[PDB]
Design a protein around this ligand. Structure first.
Ligand SMILES: [Mg+2]
Ligand SMILES: [Mg+2]
Ligand SMILES: [Mg+2]
Ligand SMILES: [Mg+2]
Ligand SMILES: [Mg+2]
Ligand SMILES: [Mg+2]
Ligand SMILES: [Mg+2]
Ligand SMILES: [Mg+2]
Ligand SMILES: [Mg+2]
Ligand SMILES: [Mg+2]
Ligand SMILES: [Mg+2]
Ligand SMILES: [Zn+2]
Lengths: 99, 114, 224, 211, 127, 82, 100, 146
RNA sequence: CCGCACAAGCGGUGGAGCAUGUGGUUUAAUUCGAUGCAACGCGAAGAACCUUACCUGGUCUUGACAUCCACGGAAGUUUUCAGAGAUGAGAAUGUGCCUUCGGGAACCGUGAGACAGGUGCUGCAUGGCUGUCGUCAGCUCGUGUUGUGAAAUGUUGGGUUAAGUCCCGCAACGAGCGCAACCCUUAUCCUUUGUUGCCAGCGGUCCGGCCGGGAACUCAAAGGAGACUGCCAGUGAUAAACUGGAGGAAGGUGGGGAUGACGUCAAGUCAUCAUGGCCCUUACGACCAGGGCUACACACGUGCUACAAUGGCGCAUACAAAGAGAAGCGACCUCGCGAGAGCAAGCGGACCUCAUAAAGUGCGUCGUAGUCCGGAUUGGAGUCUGCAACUCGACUCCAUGAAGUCGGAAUCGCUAGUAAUCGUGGAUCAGAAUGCCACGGUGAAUACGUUCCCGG
C-alpha cells in the first residue's frame, strides 16, 4: 500500500529537482506524499599514487558522494501510478520504486 | 612432592608448578589438576601424598622430561636422515619455516660474524 | 581682493629670514622680527591679473584643479572646489598624477565600478567579510580620487597652495604646458608658476581668502 | 612547481562533469569504459570537425551524447547521414540505443580545445610557434577574454633541446575557485618528436554557485 | 515543568530533560554513580548543579550517545548548563564565566598522508 | 598441510607412471616435473628424478619418505658459504 | 604492457569462463562430506585434468587502457594513473578532489 | 616561541580535592593518557600520608614540596662565548614543576612491590626533607654555587 | 628576521627478537628501476602457480595480438590417446543465421606477404607526470618619472603583519601573477522534511522502542544565520597595527584541509602510457613446465614486539566513530578445544551482515624472579584458501620458552585534542598486513627566549 521511491544521484541539486518533480506529480494526482526525506549520503574515498614510477611521496584523495533521497505515498491511486510511471529525469539520477 | 620427573616443582600455585615440568604446559597442567579435582592456588606443599600419587599417575598418562626429549630429538634426527630439505636446514642450524636468512635470523643462527 | 582685505587676513606674513629662496627678493617688502614680510603692492595686482585669466579659462568651459595637501587646509581646498563645481586634490599629490593620466583613468574606472557594483547588487553573493572589504576598497578609492573622478580629462588650469610643497605637481604641469596658479611663500621657487601669487600659504584665514575669491570669480566666469 | 589540474579542481564548483550518467559499482567500470571508447572513436571521426567537447549521459534504456564543436554542417553532411551512421556505430559500441546530439560552439577562439588543437596543427605546418600562439592570444583577447595563457614544450622549432616556453596575457587567476578557466591540453607529433601545448582562458568569475 | 538542553562534546551528544523537584539523576535508565566507573566523571557532571547549588531541587533524566566516557561527561555538563540557562537565564553570566557555555570544539585531527598519525612524522634518519 | 577431507594430492600421470613401473617390474629412475606430488606408500624401494628447476635430480624412495612432497628432495638452490 | 600479456589475460578469462560450471560441481563433490571418498578421489583427479587457466587465481586484474596489473582500482578498472586523467578532465561522474 | 611565547594550556583543578596543583601533579604522573590508573596511585599515597604523617594530606604535599622545590637553577647558554653553567632564579611555577618532576621520578626509583608504596613513602621522606628528591635539590644548589 | 632551528619539553632510534627494504655476497637465475637532503614498509593498493620482464628446458615462425588477401569449413558441442604441459594425434555430434541464392554475415582452419611484435637503447632527444627548494613571500608589468643611454624608480624609508599584510613616509601611480579570500570539513542556531532514523509527553505492552501512537528532541541533509577588530578601553602618527575587556557556541586569517607564484635540480620516470632516434627480428618476438624473484659470512635504513607489578592473569562489566558487502557479506542453530564445519535467515542495505571495540571498570590473583616477564625458535597435530601451500600462505591446538632485566657514540618526533597510548575499518586481494590509507577511545608535558645549532 506504500509506494516507496528511493532516489540516488551524485549532486544534491539534481536529486532535489527530482524530489520536487515527484511530489508535485503526487499532488497532481493529489497522492499522500511524505515529502523528500534526506537519507545519509554515502562517501567514497580513494587515495592514489599520482607520482609515476618510484616516487611515492606524492598522493591524491578523491571522493564520490552518493546523495540519497526517500519519498513515499501511502495512498496510491491510478493517477498516482500511471503519471509516476510517466516521469522522466536527468540521467544523473536513479529511481527505485517499490510497492 | 616428587612428580615422577627429574625436575622438582617450586612451592608456587599448582598449575604454575606443573608447567615447570618439561612437556607439561599451562593447558596440560590445569587439565591434570582438573582430572585430580584439586583446587588451584594450593602449592606443592600443604598437599599430602594422597594427592601427589594421583598427580604422578595422571601425568604418567603423559610423556615428560627425558622420554619426550628423546622423542623430539629422534623426530628431528630422522628428519635430517631422510635427506629432506628441512632435514638439511636442521643440519645447518637455520630457520626451517621460511624466514629471512638475509637478515635477523640470529635466534636460530646465533651471534654475528664479519 | 583689496590690500586692506588681504592685510587684515595676514597675507603679508611670511617665513623666517633664515629660510628664503633667492628669486623671491623682488616680492619681499622687508623683514621684521627675523620674519620675511611679503609686499601686498605686488601681491594684489598679480592676484587680480590671475583672477582675470582664471575667469577667462572658466568662461571657456575650463576644468580647474585646486591643489593643496596641507593637513590643515585640505577640507578648505576641497570645499573651495565644490563651491565652483571643479576638481581638486586635497591629499598627497601622487607622482605622475597628470603625466601618468592613463593609470589615473584606470583607477577612476575601478572607483566607478565598485560604487556601481554595490548599487547593482551581488554584494549578497560575496561573503559578508568580502562585501565589507569591497566597501573599504571603495572608501580607499574615494579618499584617493574623490576630487578627480569626474575630471574626465586633463585639467585646463591649476591652482596650487604652497607651491614649494607641491613641487611635483608644478613640474608635471610645466611638462604638459598646463598653466600654474599658485600662492607662493617667500621660501618657494617662483619659476614654475606662470601667474605667481606671492603670499602666505599656511595661515587658514589667508588661504580661505584666496580660495573664496578665486571661487567667486570662477562662478562669475561660468555664469556669463 | 607542479600546479594542480585546473579543470578538475573546479568540478561541481563552476565546472560541470563531462559525463553525467549515474551507475552502481556493478556496472560502473564497464560503463565508463564504453564511454571512454566512444569518446575516442568520435574524436577520431570528427578529427577535422573541430570538436571541443563530448558529453555522455546514459539513461537506463538509452545512451545520449552531445558534441560541442564549431563545424556542425561538417558533422551533418546531408540530412544527418554521417551523423546517423555515427549514431549506429556508437549505439553498437555501447550496445545500447544511441542518441547523437550536437551543440556547436560560437566563439571557437574562445574555447580551450579548439585553440590548442589549432596551435598543434599549425605546429605541424612547422609554422613559427611564436607567431602561432601570438595569433592565438590576440584573437582570444580581441574576442573578449579576460585573460589567456598558452604554453608549449619540448624540442621547439625542431631544436635538439627541450627549451619549453609559455606566453601570457590579460588576467588568469589560478587560485580563485570562483573563476572559469577553460583549460585544455593537446599534443603535436613533429618529426623531431612530441611537443605539448597547454591553454588557459579566463573568462571572468562566476557568481552564484554552479547555476 | 519540562526544560531541555542539548550538550555536544568531542564525539558524544546529550539529551537533558529536567523537572523541578529533586536531585536524582538517571542516564539511559541507569544511575550516575553506578553508571560511571570513575568518580571524576561524577564530579564533572555535578559541576553545573554543584555550582548553582540548586542540586536537590529538580531531577534529571539525561540521555547520551557515542564517544567515550569523557565525551559523555562533557556532553552531559554542557546539556545541563544549557537547560539551566533556558530555565532561569539569570545564571547565564554565572555559567559563562564559570566556563560552561563554551561548547568545547577540540576534536580529533584526521590522519594526514605521509604521517604516521595526524601530526606525527616518520623517524627520518637525517644521517 | 592441505586438509584431510580432500585427502592427499598427486598428479594423475604420476599415478600412471608409478603404477606402470609397479606392474612392469623395476624401471629406470623415471623423470618428473611435479615436485608438488605426494609420496605414496606403494612407491617404495624405487627411485625417481624430479626437475629442480634446471634439471631432474634422482632420489631413491623409501617408506618414511611417504607424506612428504617430492619437492623436499630436490633443493632448488645452491650454496656452500661466502 | 606487451600486447602478448593483454591477450594472455583475455584468453585466461575467456577460458576460465567456459569451465565455470564444471569447476563448480567438481569442487562441490570434492568438498562434499559423505561422498564415497573414492568418487571424491577420482573427482579431484578429473578436476586437475582441466586447463590450469580455469582457476580464477590465474586471472590478474589489468588496466583496460594500458595493460597495467599494479595500482588497479576495482571500482573503475583502471591503473592508478589513468584514473587521475579521466578524473581531472571530468569523465568519472561525480568524482572530485577530496579534502575533508 | 621565536615570534611569541606560548606556554602550557590553562588547566582545571582536580575535583576530587579541589586542587589544580593536584591536577598538575597527576598530569605529570599520567602515563600515556591513562588518568584513572594514575590518579589512583596519587590518591592512594595522599590518603596514607594523611594518617602516617599527620592530617591534611593536601598540605603534606607542600610540606614535602617546599622541601624539594629548588631555588637556584642552571641555564647554560653561549651569551658569553660558550656553554656557561650560570646560576639564576626562576618564577615559582618552574620550581614547583621541577619539584613535582623530581618526586615523581624518585618514586620510579624504588619499586617496593607497588607504586602506592613508592610514592607515599618517598613523599614522606620529602616531607622529612631527606631522601633523593630533596637530595637532588641540595645537589643542584651545590653544583650551581660551586 | 624567520623555522620543533635551538632552548624548554615529553616520547623514541641506536642494545635484543622479529617484520621489511637496501647494499654486499651467492646463484643457473636471484628480472628491472629508484641512490645524500629530496633512494632504502620506495615503483608494488599486496611474487605459492599466475603475476614475471629471470634462469633451466621443452617448443612455434605473417606469428599470442592487427588489417588486407586468398582457399576451405557453420559456429560450436562431446570425447579419446600421447606428453609435464605446451602440444600433437584423433573419434564423435552439430553444420546454425541474412540472402534480391549470386553470396554474405558469422566465426574457425591453411596459405600469402605486406607485416604484426619488443618490459630492446637513449628521461641528456621528448611529451606527459612527479619530487625538491617552499605554501618560501615573492615575482614582475604597463604607464610615469630620471638619465644621451646601458638603466633606475615603483619594489626603497618608517612602521606593522603569517605574508610585497597594511598604514605612513616616499616620483611615482597602478595593475597582474602570487598572499588573502571564494572551496571542503569541523565547532552554534534556525528553517525544511521525519523512514529503515527518533521517543519528550502519549494508551497498551511480553517491558524489548515494541507499538497503536507522537514530530518535539536526538539524528539525517538541504537550506540558511553567525565573527567583522564589529564593541569597549588602553597603546602607537592619532596611522597601520597592538594589548586587554565585553559580549558571544565561536575573537582576532575559529579548527583542519584542499590550493604550490616565478624558477631551481640535463632531479625521477623511454618497465603505465605517448613519443624522436637507434636495435632485434625462425628472435632481444611467441608458448609451456618447473625454478627464481623469499638465497646468507654480511653490512644499512624503516618497523614491530618486548625487557614487566601504572604490571601479567582469571572472572565479571561500560562506553565509539568510521566503513564495507551479491562468483558478496553472511546471522540464527547445530557440531567442533580452537582455527572452523554443517545448516541456513537476512540483506545491492539509516533496516541485514561483517561486529560484542580495546584501553576502562569491578573482584581475585601473582611478589620482583629472567618471573604467571618476554615470547623467538623448534616439535607435534590440525584447519582454510586454492589445480596446487616442498622450495614458499595465513591460521588453530598441544608441547617447547631463546635473546631481552630500558640499550654507547649519536640521532629522531612533536606546541593540544597534539604528543603518547588503545583499538576499529578500508584499499590491494582466491588466499596471504608489524606496510599503507583512514576512524575513534583515552589523553599529557614544555616553552626564559633567540645565544647558539641548522635552514631560510
Ligand atoms: Mg590474484
Ligand atoms: Mg633511474
Ligand atoms: Mg630501465
Ligand atoms: Mg638526467
Ligand atoms: Mg621455473
Ligand atoms: Mg624482493
Ligand atoms: Mg626499521
Ligand atoms: Mg599475561
Ligand atoms: Mg624487571
Ligand atoms: Mg608503511
Ligand atoms: Mg585515535
Ligand atoms: Zn609657506
Amino acid at each position: 500500500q506504500r509506494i516507496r521511491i528511493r532516489l540516488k544521484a551524485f549532486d544534491h541539486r539534481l536529486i532535489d529537482q527530482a524530489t520536487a518533480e515527484i511530489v508535485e506529480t503526487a499532488k497532481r494526482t493529489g497522492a499522500q506524499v511524505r515529502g523528500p526525506i534526506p537519507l545519509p549520503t554515502r562517501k567514497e574515498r580513494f587515495t592514489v599514487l599520482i607520482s609515476p614510477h618510484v616516487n611515492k611521496d606524492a598522493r591524491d584523495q578523491y571522493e564520490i558522494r552518493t546523495h540519497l533521497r526517500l519519498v513515499d505515498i501511502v495512498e496510491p491511486t491510478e493517477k498516482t501510478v500511471d503519471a509516476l510511471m510517466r516521469l522522466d529525469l536527468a540521467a544523473g539520477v536513479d529511481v527505485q520504486i517499490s510497492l | 612432592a616428587r612428580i615422577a620427573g627429574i625436575n622438582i616443582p617450586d612451592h608456587k600455585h599448582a598449575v604454575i608448578a606443573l608447567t615447570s615440568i618439561y612437556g607439561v604446559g599451562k593447558t596440560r597442567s590445569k587439565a591434570i589438576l582438573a582430572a585430580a579435582g584439586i583446587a588451584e592456588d594450593v602449592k606443592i606443599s600443604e598437599l599430602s601424598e594422597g594427592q601427589i600419587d594421583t598427580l604422578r599417575d595422571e601425568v604418567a598418562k603423559f610423556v615428560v622430561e627425558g622420554d619426550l626429549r628423546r622423542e623430539i630429538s629422534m623426530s628431528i634426527k630422522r628428519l635430517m636422515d631422510l635427506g629432506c630439505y628441512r632435514g638439511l636446514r636442521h643440519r645447518r642450524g637455520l630457520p626451517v619455516r621460511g624466514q629471512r636468512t638475509k637478515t635477523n635470523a640470529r635466534t636460530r643462527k646465533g651471534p654475528r660474524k664479519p | 581682493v583689496s590690500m586692506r582685505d588681504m592685510l587684515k587676513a595676514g597675507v603679508h606674513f611670511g617665513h623666517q629670514t633664515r629660510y628664503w629662496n633667492p628669486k623671491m627678493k623682488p616680492f619681499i617688502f622687508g623683514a621684521r622680527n627675523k620674519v620675511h614680510i611679503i609686499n601686498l603692492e605686488k601681491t594684489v595686482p598679480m592676484f587680480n591679473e590671475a583672477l582675470a585669466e582664471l575667469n577667462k579659462i572658466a568662461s571657456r568651459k575650463g576644468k580647474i584643479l585646486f591643489v593643496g595637501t596641507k593637513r590643515a587646509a585640505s577640507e578648505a581646498v576641497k570645499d573651495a572646489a565644490l563651491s565652483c563645481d571643479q576638481f581638486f586634490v586635497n591629499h598627497r599629490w601622487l607622482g605622475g598624477m597628470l603625466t601618468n593620466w592613463k593609470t589615473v583613468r584606470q583607477s577612476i574606472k575601478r572607483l566607478k565600478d565598485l560604487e556601481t557594483q554595490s548599487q547593482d547588487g551581488t554584494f549578497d553573493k560575496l561573503t559578508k567579510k568580502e562585501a565589507l572589504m569591497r566597501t573599504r576598497e571603495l572608501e580607499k578609492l574615494e579618499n584617493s580620487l574623490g576630487g578627480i573622478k569626474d575630471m574626465g580629462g586633463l585639467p585646463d588650469a591649476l591652482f596650487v597652495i604652497d607651491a614649494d610643497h607641491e613641487h611635483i605637481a608644478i613640474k608635471e604641469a610645466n611638462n604638459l604646458g598646463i598653466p600654474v596658479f599658485a600662492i607662493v611663500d617667500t621660501n618657494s621657487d617662483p619659476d614654475g608658476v606662470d601667474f605667481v601669487i606671492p603670499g602666505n600659504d599656511d595661515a587658514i584665514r589667508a588661504v580661505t581668502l584666496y580660495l573664496g575669491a578665486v571661487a567667486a570669480t570662477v562662478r562669475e566666469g561660468r555664469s556669463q | 612547481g607542479q600546479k594542480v589540474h585546473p579543470n578538475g579542481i573546479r568540478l561541481g564548483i563552476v565546472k560541470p562533469w563531462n559525463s553525467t550518467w549515474f551507475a552502481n559499482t556493478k556496472e560502473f567500470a564497464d560503463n565508463l569504459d564504453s564511454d571512454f571508447k566512444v569518446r575516442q572513436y568520435l574524436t577520431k571521426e570528427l578529427a577535422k570537425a573541430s570538436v571541443s567537447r563530448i558529453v555522455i549521459e546514459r539513461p537506463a534504456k538509452s545512451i545520449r551524447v552531445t558534441i560541442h564543436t564549431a563545424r556542425p554542417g561538417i558533422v551533418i553532411g546531408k540530412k544527418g547521414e554521417d551523423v546517423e551512421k555515427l549514431r549506429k556505430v556508437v549505439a553498437d559500441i555501447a550496445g545500447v540505443p544511441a542518441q547523437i546530439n550536437i551543440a556547436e560552439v560560437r566563439k571557437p577562439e574562445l574555447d580551450a580545445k579548439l585553440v590548442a588543437d589549432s596551435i598543434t596543427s599549425q605546429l605541424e605546418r612547422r609554422v613559427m610557434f611564436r607567431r602561432a600562439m601570438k595569433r592565438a592570444v590576440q584573437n582570444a583577447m580581441r574576442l573578449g577574454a579576460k585573460g589567456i595563457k598558452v604554453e608549449v614544450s619540448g624540442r621547439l622549432g625542431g631544436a635538439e633541446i627541450a627549451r619549453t616556453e609559455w606566453y601570457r596575457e590579460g588576467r588568469v587567476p589560478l587560485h580563485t575557485l570562483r573563476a572559469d578557466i577553460d583549460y585544455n591540453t593537446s599534443e603535436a607529433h613533429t618529426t623531431y618528436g612530441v611537443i605539448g601545448v597547454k591553454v588557459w582562458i579566463f573568462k571572468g568569475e562566476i557568481l552564484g554557485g554552479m547555476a | 515543568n519540562q526544560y531541555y538542553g542539548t550538550g555536544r562534546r568531542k564525539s558524544s551528544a546529550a539529551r537533558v530533560f529536567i523537572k523541578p523537584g529533586n536531585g536524582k539523576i538517571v542516564i539511559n535508565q541507569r544511575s550516575l554513580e553506578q553508571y560511571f566507573g570513575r568518580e571524576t566523571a561524577r564530579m564533572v557532571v555535578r559541576q553545573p548543579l554543584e555550582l548553582v547549588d540548586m542540586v536537590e531541587k529538580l531531577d534529571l533524566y539525561i540521555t547520551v550517545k557515542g564517544g567515550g566516557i569523557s565525551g559523555q561527561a562533557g556532553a552531559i555538563r554542557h546539556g545541563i548548563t544549557r537547560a539551566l540557562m533556558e530555565y532561569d537565564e539569570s545564571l547565564r553570566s554565572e555559567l559563562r564565566k564559570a566556563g560552561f557555555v563554551t561548547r568545547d570544539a577540540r576534536q580529533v585531527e584526521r590522519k594526514k598522508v605521509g604521517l604516521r598519525k595526524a601530526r606525527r612524522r616518520p623517524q627520518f634518519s637525517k644521517r | 598441510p592441505r586438509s584431510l577431507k580432500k585427502g592427499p594430492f598427486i598428479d594423475l600421470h604420476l599415478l600412471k607412471k608409478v603404477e606402470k613401473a609397479v606392474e612392469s617390474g623395476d624401471k629406470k629412475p623415471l623423470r618428473t616435473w611435479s615436485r608438488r606430488s605426494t609420496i605414496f606408500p606403494n612407491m617404495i624401494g624405487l627411485t625417481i628424478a624430479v626437475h629442480n628447476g634446471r634439471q631432474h635430480v634422482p632420489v631413491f624412495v623409501t617408506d618414511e619418505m611417504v607424506g612428504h612432497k617430492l619437492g623436499e628432495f630436490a633443493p632448488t638452490r645452491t650454496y656452500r658459504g661466502h | 604492457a606487451k600486447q602478448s600479456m593483454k591477450a594472455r589475460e583475455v584468453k585466461r578469462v575467456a577460458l576460465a569462463d567456459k569451465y565455470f560450471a564444471k569447476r563448480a560441481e567438481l569442487k562441490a563433490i570434492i568438498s562434499d562430506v559423505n561422498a564415497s571418498d573414492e568418487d571424491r578421489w577420482n573427482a579431484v583427479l578429473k578436476l586437475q585434468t582441466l586447463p590450469r587457466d580455469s582457476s580464477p587465481s590465474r586471472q590478474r586484474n589489468r588496466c583496460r587502457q594500458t595493460g597495467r596489473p599494479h595500482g588497479f582500482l576495482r571500482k573503475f578498472g583502471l591503473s592508478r594513473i589513468k584514473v587521475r586523467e579521466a578524473a581531472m578532465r571530468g569523465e568519472i561522474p561525480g568524482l572530485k578532489k577530496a579534502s575533508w | 616561541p621565536r615570534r611569541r611565547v606560548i606556554g602550557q594550556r590553562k588547566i582545571l583543578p582536580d575535583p576530587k580535592f579541589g586542587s589544580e596543583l593536584l591536577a598538575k601533579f597527576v598530569n605529570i604522573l599520567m602515563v600515556d593518557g591513562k588518568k584513572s590508573t594514575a590518579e589512583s596511585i596519587v590518591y592512594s599515597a595522599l590518603e596514607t600520608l594523611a594518617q602516617r604523617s599527620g592530617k591534611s594530606e593536601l598540605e603534606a604535599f607542600e610540606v614535602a614540596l617546599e622541601n624539594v622545590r629548588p631555588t637556584v637553577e642552571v641555564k647554560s647558554r653561549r651569551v658569553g662565548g660558550s656553554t656557561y653553567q650560570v646560576p639564576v632564579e626562576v618564577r615559582p611555577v618552574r620550581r614547583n614543576a621541577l619539584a613535582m618532576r623530581w618526586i615523581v621520578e624518585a618514586a620510579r626509583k624504588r619499586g617496593d612491590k607497588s607504586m602506592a608504596l613508592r610514592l607515599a613513602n618517598e613523599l614522606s621522606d620529602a616531607a622529612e626533607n631527606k631522601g633523593t628528591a630533596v637530595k637532588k635539590r641540595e645537589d643542584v644548589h651545590r653544583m650551581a654555587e660551586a
